[PDB]
Design a protein around this ligand. Structure first.
Ligand code: W6V
Length: 167
């Protein structure tokens, strides 16, 4: 049993809810919250900007030190950093950004990072300002992630379309 409430069950291991991932993280304090990161861990907008704002910029300060030591992530890659006030850990995952011309086949590689964690609160990778089709992102998620993933979808209209169209 876990703390996640109000989710619709899509599969054995994937759950979905219309929710603000920031507000959900603050309520649940999950072991792992996933960030929709870029390779520079520059948390300007979208899910990343919202998560970072909720940490009062502490996520960005920690991220800048990580990049200064390690250099940029790979598209499709990830790193584990603090969850600050939102979670124990933040898994920063880089999905391909269609608005930069990145290979959408890298979306499966991105979701494979989730399999290193038994339970996660996450957004749909490469959705929103990363430009991918969220219906496609949900299909890759279901077909790639084997661990237990609780997906937060900010937009109510999109949430209803994802559920209604789910095969
Ligand atoms: O945003 C999209 N679909 C949405 N439906 C409801 C709210 S947003 C999208 C983005 C890229 C390619 C195809 C579709």
């Amino acid at each position: 049993v876990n703390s996640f409430s109000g989710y619709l069950k899509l599969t054995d291991n994937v759950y979905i809810k219309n929710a603000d991932i920031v507000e959900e993280a603050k309520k649940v304090k999950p072991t792992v919250v996933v960030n929709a990161a870029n390779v520079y861990l520059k948390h300007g907008g979208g899910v990343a900007g919202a998560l970072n704002k909720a940490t009062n910029n502490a996520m960005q300060v920690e991220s800048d030190d990580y990049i200064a030591t390690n250099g940029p992530l790979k598209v499709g890659g990830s790193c584990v950093l603090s969850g600050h006030n939102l979670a124990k850990h933040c898994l920063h995952v880089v999905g391909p950004n269609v608005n930069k011309g990145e290979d959408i086949q890298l979306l499966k590689s991105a979701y494979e990072n989730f399999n290193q964690h038994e339970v996660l609160l996450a957004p749909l990778l490469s959705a929103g300002i990363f430009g991918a089709d969220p219906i496609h992102s949900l299909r890759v998620c279901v077909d790639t992630v084997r661990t237990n993933v609780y997906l937060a979808v900010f937009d109510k209209n999109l949430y209803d379309k994802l559920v209604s169209s789910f095969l």
